[PDB]
Design a protein around this motif. Structure first.
Motif, short mmCIF file in Angstrom:
data_model
loop_
_atom_site.label_atom_id
_atom_site.label_comp_id
_atom_site.label_asym_id
_atom_site.label_seq_id
_atom_site.Cartn_x
_atom_site.Cartn_y
_atom_site.Cartn_z
N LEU A 238 0.79 -1.31 -0.07
CA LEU A 238 -0.12 0.07 0.02
C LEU A 238 0.76 1.45 0.07
O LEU A 238 0.54 2.28 -0.68
CB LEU A 238 -1.04 -0.01 1.20
N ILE A 239 1.96 1.41 0.77
CA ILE A 239 2.86 2.41 0.95
C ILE A 239 3.61 2.44 -0.53
O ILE A 239 3.94 3.86 -0.75
CB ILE A 239 3.81 2.14 1.97
N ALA B 95 8.30 13.76 -3.04
CA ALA B 95 8.83 12.62 -2.51
C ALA B 95 9.87 12.79 -1.68
O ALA B 95 10.91 13.73 -1.91
CB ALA B 95 9.27 11.60 -3.75
N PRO B 96 9.99 12.44 -0.28
CA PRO B 96 11.16 12.74 0.37
C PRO B 96 12.44 11.83 0.18
O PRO B 96 12.48 10.82 -0.54
CB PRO B 96 10.72 12.06 1.89
N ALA B 97 13.67 12.28 0.67
CA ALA B 97 14.91 11.44 0.55
C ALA B 97 14.83 10.05 1.21
O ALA B 97 15.53 9.17 0.94
CB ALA B 97 16.05 12.43 0.83
N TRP C 116 3.77 6.51 -5.10
CA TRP C 116 3.95 6.86 -6.41
C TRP C 116 2.71 8.18 -6.36
O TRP C 116 3.42 9.04 -7.33
CB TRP C 116 3.17 5.75 -7.15
N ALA C 117 1.89 8.02 -5.81
CA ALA C 117 0.89 9.16 -5.67
C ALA C 117 1.88 10.61 -5.32
O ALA C 117 1.44 11.74 -5.84
CB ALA C 117 -0.21 9.25 -4.85
N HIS C 118 2.65 10.47 -4.40
CA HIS C 118 3.76 11.47 -3.85
C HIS C 118 4.53 12.13 -4.74
O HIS C 118 4.66 13.05 -5.15
CB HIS C 118 4.11 11.04 -2.34
N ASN C 119 5.28 10.91 -5.42
CA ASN C 119 6.19 11.34 -6.43
C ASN C 119 5.73 12.01 -7.68
O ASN C 119 6.41 12.73 -8.53
CB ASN C 119 6.88 10.06 -7.04
N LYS C 120 4.36 11.57 -8.07
CA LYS C 120 3.71 12.19 -8.95
C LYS C 120 3.62 13.82 -9.07
O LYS C 120 3.67 14.46 -10.03
CB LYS C 120 2.11 11.69 -9.19
#
Ligand code: CLA
Ligand code: CLA
Ligand code: CLA
Ligand code: CLA
Ligand code: CLA
Ligand code: CLA
Ligand code: CLA
Ligand code: CLA
Ligand SMILES: CC1=C(/C=C/C(C)=C/C=C/C(C)=C/C=C/C=C(C)/C=C/C=C(C)/C=C/C2=C(C)CCCC2(C)C)C(C)(C)CCC1
Ligand SMILES: CC1=C(/C=C/C(C)=C/C=C/C(C)=C/C=C/C=C(C)/C=C/C=C(C)/C=C/C2=C(C)CCCC2(C)C)C(C)(C)CCC1
Ligand SMILES: CC1=C(C/C=C(\C)CCC[C@H](C)CCC[C@H](C)CCCC(C)C)C(=O)c2ccccc2C1=O
Lengths: 141, 152, 144, 73, 11, 80, 42, 742
Positions: free
Chosen positions: H687-688, H701-703, H693-697
């Protein structure tokens, strides 16, 4: 290499424990591990407790292959001692198990056949629908 | 008025509840000396209760059949401040936070090891970034039109 | 032999304990199983009669003895059925016995005939007869 | 959740007064006190040291369900 | 005992 | 007995052979990589399914795979 | 002094100072304006 | 020989290490690549044994941590004393203790929480406290607030001194290894110095300060008129009027005619009628005797001189029938590893805490403590929970020692090897006894319920149909009742009133103590206690014994103390580490403690506590229905959980609303724990993945890449939440009920 024999080797000094052989030993099989120790020293048994191994050739009986291998790898790591174990059936047949070519498996040696090699990446396997209604499996091809 | 409701400055159950609460407080007030500190505290509580009831009545809410105010999220012009006026405010503030965070992440993407900047925040760059969110809708709209909001 | 999964302790191997355990009907070898089954059934039925007649639902009425004896007889019948089922499912007909053939001394001995189809059948029949006889004898003794 | 909602609404309607639900359904202590605790009084009294009545089997099955649910853990 | 209670409500 | 298959992505780092607790795998000479060796699994009937070999395998996805199958006394690890 | 500031810049300490300041602001706002169910300014 | 050995400035105090985290371990110190790193940085913070291998550094770190803990404890005590001094109604409670509820916390008036300032009494509003501090202060002789202020200031100063001492001993002068391993001197000083001198000094305070002030208080004098404690020391006339014996001074004690001191050093025993507590003279006498005994017993071990005894000599020279050579290499094991000492000390402390709880509810040692029901309930429950937790932790540390600090080559012990060589028999017999005990104990209740539901009340195991009476306990009670006449000529009365026979003791219209009868219900409940204790012992002992190796896994020592599993093979090998055995035993400890505290609460509310009238009759709280309603599970669910929860849930809008709020919150947390307890890691990781993916779009996205919690962390979170929720539920329920009705 020609497999060896274990005719009359003595045994380490022990007081007895309840983690020994069971009915399966009389019914199905057991394993026998033999090694050679340069001095009488105390080691720890896989079943439980501590025992003393004598100088010269030593022989021991165990119930599973994992116990034999664990004791052997402890001997190799800590005492620097070569070892070899066989499998014994109720009928008296003795089968040589550990190094079959006389060399530990971690080192390559010519004369060894390849078994179960797939010459493709793990992602080239076919889907289960391709192999349906037949006995074969996708990874078997 | 709306959905068979009664204005809160005309209903009787509101006054009955106010009287019940005031009597409950005054019952405990009698126990102590009139000049003692607990008496002052209870008087302050009574004043607060009366002010709250008066403000609720004057603000134009609508009590129900049982006597409590009811919120209207429908969109009527007489309840602009019930849901719609606060909600927009929230979004503004909320957007602020999000925008700021996003900016900071980009501000540390250039370096070779951004993890050190993530676990140990730096205050100068963060303070520079913090106040840029006061105009977040304009910058966000310009970035959306330009096309830099979405990765490719 | 230390490496066998057992220990030698005063209770496990004592002259008194070994003598007592080697005389029980279930541990004789040269005796045909029927007599040993009869003895075991007699003992078990006579033991079993008591609690049913003492703690049953009709212990306070005048029907205590008969109800308890009937319950004990039912338990004996069920145990006989279980023994017959186990004997059918475990041992085969023509195969030889699977009992040990040598003792602690190492001297060879005739294998026990109990671990066979016919031997187990004789044992179960003897147990059933002995249990019924013990139940009825206990009932006769208690209320006469 | 759905069955709890339906049962409480309809039992309050049937009993005569609908103000109890309308005033106690807005906070969770209302559900815990005015629905389960209030309505379990007759169910838990199926059998007691004084005697028993026709609701005994329902109390027994109540305890049976509790035991099975706890055994699942 | 009154002063101890009043210490909380000084403001 | 389970099924252990070796794919051609292997680089011959000898880790899987050392990790096995039952002496199932071994290494044979090869020519498809720099190390000039590959793994093989002759004694499959001794595998217990512990999946220790898969834990120590550096590759984008593992070059040695264990598929569980019909169980038996040796593969189940029963001492009685 | 450099390492003192660096430690005070770590995540838990900065987080707790920020949350304490925010809680103080919310507390003071709620004390100045006792209770409110709607926005009456407009 | 015995000497002081120190090292000068082993480490330098610098802020450079604070800047970078995880300096203790290299793999932590490298840098964060995923979120798991963070969760590791707290897991190995106090794992001193794995940071290094030298014993000296570990010992020094342990010493410094002990000093820090002492400083924290002193700060907590100072805070409690200052709260008692400033925001409290102690002076009002002193004059009229029976009709005033103690309270030492006042809530601000920020939001509407001012309703939490309930009217305890005496012209005060505040949260009622149940810590029992007021009784302690009254028994100590404190009658003002300036003394409490001085005590708080002294506590703060002591906390500062402890902090400075910890810093000095770690960073300036660090004791050497040979200093630590001198156990003879440590034992001598801990017995003669810490336990003897301390109790002797407390006896001195009780004789000189507490006794006269408490006599004046019990005589009915107003607290503001009692002379100050130092006036008793300065003036001999006041003491002579109060006690004529003091007129002779210290002359009798040096003359061995100690009977002259019989005025304030007695042997009466029993309970004092005025306050319902033990006589203070008896307590002072007991403290003096304990001081003498400890001072005598602290001079047993040989240190730096000819006289004494050697621990090694005692252990080696002991020859017995069952042991034999036995204890030979135990000295090295117990002086080399910290974990063995930790395990033994933890077990002893847990057992001591449980015994303390039992003795304290049995005989009230403070004035006006017995009649306070909330204080008694809170103290009993708290102490028993603490004891259970400590006893559980002992097994975990024993397993740690067995895994990582046991080698048979350098240090060999015969008894340990003999125990290890036959673990199967031990486990089999423990399993059989657990099964038998549980089967009988719970089958009795199930049979009672079934015979009740079918309308057959004459076939129960009850007080009327089939009786199972605890004859041995009744015989012991009768023997204790008859003891003071014959077995104890010196004692005037019984040691405690709990034993059958005697007279009811009540203070201010409330029953303080009376004999507690025993019947079938006590029999059944005690057997349930035994069953739960046996099961917990079985779990912990199996985990400890099978830690090194097992039949399934012959090399479990290499994998370590904390490993989730070995793999899907062998049929499945989940939860084989000793850590998982501790995690499993926590639940059973929780079960046993919950059952025990429920039994104690119901029995005390039913057959001891209550009210007494002028005529003489006694009306208990619940009407004494424990003897007939507690033999069925329906009785426990209906008459105890359903009936006694009315006060908790109907506390809304009153001064006890926080108890209902916590009652609901604990339920929420308990339900939350099952989320971690039931599920697995792979689903959450997958799920994460989509969330990431939704974040990176959106380029946010964090390091530090997010990662799902490891298996062991998930199990730990689940058990922590479960225990917290259950304990909070019981706490809220007990406190609300006993404050409302008590
Ligand atoms: C756990 C223990 C337990 C016990 C002790 C009892 C006891 C009792 N039940 Mg209850 N019951 C239980 C659980 C239990 N129940 C459960 C779980 C249920 C399900 C809800 C019921 C439901 C139930 C019903 C429906 C009824 C009873 C009734 C009864 C009675 C009948 C007993 C009987 O006849 O068989 C006893 C049979 C024996 C063969 C005894 C065997 C045990 C022997 C003594 C072993 C001793 C071993 C030896 C000493 C060890 C060493 C050997 C060495 C010397 C060599 C008895 C008083 C009946 C009744 O009404 O009674 C009033 C009835 O109708 N029970
Ligand atoms: C830093 C800013 C930040 C931003 C812009 C976003 C953005 C987004 N989140 Mg993410 N998220 C964040 C932090 C952030 N997140 C953190 C810290 C966590 C862990 C608690 C998550 C966990 C998370 C989940 C579980 C989900 C999202 C989802 C979403 C999307 C929908 C909006 C929403 O549901 O919010 C959800 C917001 C939260 C649950 C809590 C966010 C509040 C944090 C604490 C504020 C940021 C503060 C940060 C410390 C500031 C530092 C900067 C400073 C140094 C200058 C959206 C793309 C949803 C989705 O996938 O949509 C497609 C969703 O399912 N997020
Ligand atoms: C975090 C931000 C914060 C802010 C902006 C304020 C703001 C304010 N405070 Mg508060 N206050 C805070 C935290 C804060 N306080 C904290 C942590 C405490 C505990 C020491 C107090 C205790 C406090 C007191 C004791 C007083 C104020 C008062 C005031 C006013 C000062 C002029 C103003 C409304 C003063 C006032 O307005 O009283 C009527 C006042 O006397 N404050
Ligand atoms: C041991 C733990 C301990 C604990 C848990 C408390 C707890 C509490 N203290 Mg106490 N206190 C302690 C020790 C402790 N104290 C010590 C050692 C001293 C002596 C220095 C004091 C002196 C003290 C004072 C002088 C006051 C409190 C007050 C308070 C309350 C409010 C605290 C606050 O909101 O912070 C405020 C937050 C920040 C400073 C940031 C709270 C119940 C306050 C009170 O209850 O007023 C009604 C208050 O006025 N405490
Ligand atoms: C008679 C003197 C003496 C005394 C009183 C103590 C007492 C104590 N020791 Mg022991 N100890 C002694 C001799 C003594 N020791 C010697 C000679 C050695 C070396 C073999 C040790 C080795 C030792 C270790 C390794 C540890 C302790 C610890 C403890 C503390 C346990 C906590 C407690 O129970 O709370 C009781 C509460 C109080 C009495 C605290 C009040 C403060 C006391 C009175 C200070 C005065 C004590 C000190 C010995 C004298 C000052 C020396 C200095 C001024 C020159 C306690 C302070 C443990 C501890 O907590 O760590 C710090 C600990 O880890 N001790
Ligand atoms: C007498 C004191 C004592 C001491 C000195 C130790 C010492 C040690 N323990 Mg032992 N232990 C004890 C008692 C003690 N234990 C008890 C009573 C138990 C039973 C639960 C255990 C069970 C135990 C386990 C299961 C383990 C240890 C391990 C360890 C070592 C690592 C410590 C660690 O890393 O934690 C660092 C600190 C933390 C992780 C803190 C965790 C947070 C706690 C659990 C939360 C409590 C919640 C709080 C009260 C609720 C407030 C809510 C609010 C915050 C919102 C350390 C040497 C660990 C080990 O690996 O040893 C080598 C380990 O695995 N211990
Ligand atoms: C809620 C119900 C529940 C129940 C009933 C049990 C039951 C038991 N636990 Mg489990 N357990 C539970 C929850 C439960 N557990 C939870 C939540 C956990 C946490 C993960 C564990 C973890 C756990 C551990 C770690 C251990 C156990 C063990 C035990 C056993 C102890 C021996 C004994 O008392 O059995 C006897 C039986 C009972 C008391 C149950 C009731 C039976 C009554 C008498 C009815 C019998 C009716 C009758 C025969 C029906 C026949 C009719 C049919 C033919 C139609 C037993 C099987 C221990 C064990 O196995 O060692 C022996 C142990 O090691 N449990
Ligand atoms: C009643 C307890 C409980 C609760 C509250 C949850 C909650 C949730 N479940 Mg879980 N679950 C449970 C039991 C529970 N579960 C059980 C028994 C199972 C069976 C194994 C599962 C299996 C499961 C699955 C399979 C899935 C979830 C998912 C979810 C989430 C759904 C989205 C949503 O509801 O967000 C609402 C959020 C909240 C109510 C969380 C609480 C917010 C807290 C209180 C706020 C923090 C406030 C406060 C300051 C705390 C400070 C702490 C202190 C230390 C300082 C949510 C986190 C789904 C998911 O992940 O969706 C994204 C999903 O995939 N659950
Ligand atoms: C409460 C508290 C506190 C306080 C405390 C105190 C105040 C203490 C004190 C203490 C003390 C005050 C002590 C004392 C002691 C003493 C001693 C210990 C003594 C001894 C003696 C001796 C031993 C003697 C001997 C002898 C003899 C007998 C004979 C002759 C000779 C001689 C003389 C030598 C504080 C704040 C801190 C903290 C918190 C709590
Ligand atoms: C359990 C517990 C607790 C408690 C504790 C306590 C209460 C303690 C106490 C303690 C004590 C109470 C101690 C004491 C000590 C003492 C001492 C340590 C002393 C010393 C002395 C000296 C040193 C002296 C000297 C001298 C002089 C001066 C004179 C004469 C001579 C001589 C030399 C002898 C609490 C609650 C916290 C919680 C946790 C747990
Ligand atoms: C819920 C759950 C998760 C997922 C749980 C996660 C990811 C924990 C999340 C913790 C917090 C809420 C994440 C954010 C923490 C940051 C410190 C937030 C910083 C910003 C401010 C809010 C301070 C598992 O990974 C898991 C693994 C194995 C068994 C069970 C489970 C399981 O049940």
């Amino acid at each position: 290499t020609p497999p060896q024999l274990d005719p009359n080797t003595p045994s380490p000094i022990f007081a007895g424990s309840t983690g020994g052989l069971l009915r399966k030993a009389q019914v199905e099989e057991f394993y026998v591990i033999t090694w050679n120790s340069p001095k009488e020293q105390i080691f720890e048994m896989p079943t439980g407790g501590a025992a003393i191994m004598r100088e010269g050739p030593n022989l021991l009986k165990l119930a599973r292959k994992e116990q034999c291998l664990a004791l052997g790898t402890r001997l190799r790591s800590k005492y620097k001692i070569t070892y070899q174990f066989y499998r014994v059936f109720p009928n008296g047949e003795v089968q040589y198990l550990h190094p079959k070519d006389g060399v530990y498996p971690e080192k390559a040696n010519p004369g060894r056949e390849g078994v179960g090699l797939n010459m493709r990446s793990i992602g080239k396997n076919v889907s289960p629908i391709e192999v349906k209604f037949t006995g074969k499996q996708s990874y078997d091809l | 008025d709306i959905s068979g409701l009664t204005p809160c400055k005309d209903s009787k159950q509101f006054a009955k509840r106010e009287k019940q609460q005031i009597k409950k407080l005054e019952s405990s007030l009698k126990l102590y000396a009139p000049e003692s500190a607990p008496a002052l505290a209870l008087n302050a509580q009574i004043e607060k209760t009366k002010r709250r009831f008066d403000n609720y009545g004057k603000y134009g809410l609508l009590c129900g059949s049982d006597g409590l105010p009811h919120l209207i999220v429908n969109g009527d012009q007489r309840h602009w401040g019930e849901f719609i006026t606060p909600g927009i405010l929230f979004l503004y503030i909320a957007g602020w936070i999000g925008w700021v965070g996003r900016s900071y992440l980009i501000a540390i993407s250039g370096e070779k090891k951004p993890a050190m900047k993530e676990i140990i925040i730096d205050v100068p760059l963060a303070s520079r970034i913090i106040f840029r969110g006061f105009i977040w809708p304009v910058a966000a709209y310009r970035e959306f039109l330009n096309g830099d909001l979405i990765a490719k | 032999d230390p490496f066998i999964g057992s220990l030698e302790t005063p209770v496990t191997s004592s002259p008194l304990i070994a003598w007592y355990l080697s005389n029980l009907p279930g541990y004789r070898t040269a005796v045909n199983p029927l007599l040993r089954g009869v003895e075991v059934g007699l003992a078990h039925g006579f033991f079993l009669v008591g609690p049913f007649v003492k703690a049953g639902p009709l212990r306070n009425t005048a029907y205590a003895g008969s109800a308890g004896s009937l319950a004990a007889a039912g338990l004996v019948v069920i145990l006989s059925m279980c023994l017959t089922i186990y004997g059918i499912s475990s041992f085969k007909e023509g195969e030889p016995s699977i009992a040990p053939s040598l003792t602690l001394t190492g001297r060879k001995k005739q294998p026990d005939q109990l671990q066979t189809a016919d031997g187990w059948a004789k044992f179960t029949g003897g147990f059933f007869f002995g249990g019924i006889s013990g139940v009825t004898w206990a009932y006769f003794l208690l209320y006469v | 959740w759905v069955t709890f909602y339906w049962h409480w609404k309809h039992i309050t309607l049937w009993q005569g007064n609908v103000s109890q639900f309308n005033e106690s359904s807005t906070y969770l202590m209302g559900w815990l006190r005015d629905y389960l605790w209030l309505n379990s009084s007759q169910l838990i009294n199926g059998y007691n040291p004084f005697g028993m009545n026709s609701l005994s089997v329902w109390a027994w099955m109540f305890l049976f369900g509790h035991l099975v649910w706890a055994t699942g853990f | 005992s009154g002063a101890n209670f009043a210490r909380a409500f000084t403001v | 007995s389970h099924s252990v298959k070796i794919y051609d992505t292997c680089i011959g780092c000898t880790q899987c052979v050392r990790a096995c607790p039952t002496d199932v795998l071994e290494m044979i000479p090869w020519d498809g990589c720099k190390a000039k060796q590959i793994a093989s699994a002759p004694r499959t009937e001794d595998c217990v399914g512990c999946k220790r070999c898969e834990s120590a395998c550096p590759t984008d996805f593992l070059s040695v795979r264990v598929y569980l199958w019909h169980e038996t006394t040796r593969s189940m690890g029963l001492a009685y | 002094m450099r390492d003192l500031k660096t430690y005070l810049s770590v995540a838990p300490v900065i987080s707790t100072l920020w949350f304490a300041a925010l809680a103080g602001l919310l507390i003071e706002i709620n004390r100045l304006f006792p209770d409110a169910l709607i926005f009456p300014f407009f | 020989e015995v000497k002081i050995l120190v090292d000068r400035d082993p480490i330098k105090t610098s802020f450079e290490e604070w800047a970078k985290p995880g300096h203790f371990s290299r793999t932590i110190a490298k840098g964060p690549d995923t979120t798991t790193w963070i969760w590791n940085l707290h897991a190995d913070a106090h794992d001193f044994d794995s940071h290094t291998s030298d014993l000296e550094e570990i010992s020094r770190k342990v010493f410094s941590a002990h000093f820090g803990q002492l400083s924290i404890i002193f700060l907590w005590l100072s805070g409690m004393y200052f709260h008692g001094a400033r925001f409290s109604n102690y002076e009002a409670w002193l004059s009229d203790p029976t009709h005033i509820g103690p309270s030492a916390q006042v809530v601000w008036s920020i939001v509407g929480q001012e309703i939490l300032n309930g009217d305890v009494g005496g012209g005060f509003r505040g949260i009622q406290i149940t810590s029992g501090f007021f009784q302690i202060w009254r028994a100590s002789g404190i009658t003002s607030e300036l003394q409490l202020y001085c005590t708080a200031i002294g506590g703060l100063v002591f906390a500062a001194l402890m902090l400075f001492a910890g810093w000095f001993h770690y960073h300036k002068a660090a004791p050497k290894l040979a200093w630590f391993q001198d156990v003879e001197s440590m034992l001598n000083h801990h017995l003669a110095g810490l336990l003897g001198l301390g109790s002797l000094s407390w006896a001195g305070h009780q004789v000189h300060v507490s006794l006269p002030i408490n006599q004046f208080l019990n005589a009915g004098v107003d607290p503001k008129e009692i002379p100050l404690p130092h006036e008793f020391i300065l003036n001999r006339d006041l003491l002579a009027q109060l006690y004529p014996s003091f007129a002779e001074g210290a002359t009798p004690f040096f003359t061995l005619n100690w009977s002259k001191y019989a005025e304030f050093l007695t042997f009466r025993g029993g309970l004092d009628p005025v306050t319902g507590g033990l006589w203070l003279t008896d307590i002072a006498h007991h403290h003096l005797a304990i001081a003498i005994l400890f001072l005598i017993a602290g001079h047993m071990y040989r240190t730096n001189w000819g006289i004494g005894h050697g621990i090694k000599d005692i252990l080696e020279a002991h020859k017995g029938p069952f042991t034999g050579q036995g204890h030979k290499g135990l000295y090295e094991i117990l002086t080399t590893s910290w974990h063995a000492q930790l395990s033994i000390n933890l077990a002893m402390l847990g057992s001591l805490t449980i015994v303390v709880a039992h003795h304290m509810y049995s005989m009230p040692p403070y004035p006006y403590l017995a009649t306070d029901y909330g204080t008694q309930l809170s103290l009993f429950t708290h102490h028993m929970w603490i004891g259970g937790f400590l006893i559980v932790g002992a097994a975990a540390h024993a397993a740690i020692f067995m895994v990582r600090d046991y080698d048979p080559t350098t240090r060999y012990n015969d008894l340990l090897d003999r125990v290890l060589r036959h673990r199967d028999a031990i486990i089999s017999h423990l399993n059989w006894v657990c099964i038998f005990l549980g089967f009988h104990s719970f089958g009795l209740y199930i049979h009672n319920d079934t015979m009740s539901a079918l309308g057959r009340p004459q076939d129960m195991f009850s007080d009327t149909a089939i009786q199972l009476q605890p004859v041995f306990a009744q015989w012991i009670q009768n023997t204790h009742a008859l003891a003071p006449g014959t077995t104890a000529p010196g004692a005037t009365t019984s040691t405690s009133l709990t034993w059958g026979g005697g007279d009811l003791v009540a203070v201010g219209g409330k029953v303080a103590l009376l004999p507690i009868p025993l019947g079938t219900a006590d029999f059944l409940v005690h057997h349930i206690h035994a069953f739960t204790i046996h099961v917990t012992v079985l779990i912990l002992l199996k985990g400890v014994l099978f830690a090194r190796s097992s039949r399934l896994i012959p090399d479990k020592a290499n994998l370590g103390f904390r490993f989730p599993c070995d793999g899907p093979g062998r049929g499945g090998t989940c939860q084989v580490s000793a850590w998982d055995h501790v995690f499993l035993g926590l639940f059973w400890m929780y079960n046993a403690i919950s059952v025990v505290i429920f039994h104690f609460s119901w029995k005390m509310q039913s057959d001891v506590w209550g009210s007494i009238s002028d005529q003489g009759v006694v009306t208990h709280i619940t009407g004494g229905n424990f003897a007939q309603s507690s033999i069925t599970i329906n009785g426990w669910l209906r008459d105890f959980l359903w009936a006694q929860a009315s006060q908790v849930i109907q506390s809304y809008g009153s001064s006890l609303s926080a108890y209902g709020l916590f009652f609901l919150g604990a339920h929420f947390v308990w339900a939350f724990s099952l989320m971690f307890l039931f599920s697995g890691r792979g689903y959450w990781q997958e799920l994460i993945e989509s969330i990431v993916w939704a974040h990176n779009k959106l380029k946010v996205a964090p390091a530090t890449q997010p990662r799902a919690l490891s298996i062991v962390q998930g199990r730990a979170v689940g058990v922590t939440h479960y225990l917290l929720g259950g304990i909070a539920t019981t706490w809220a329920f007990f406190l609300a009920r006993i404050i409302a009705v008590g």
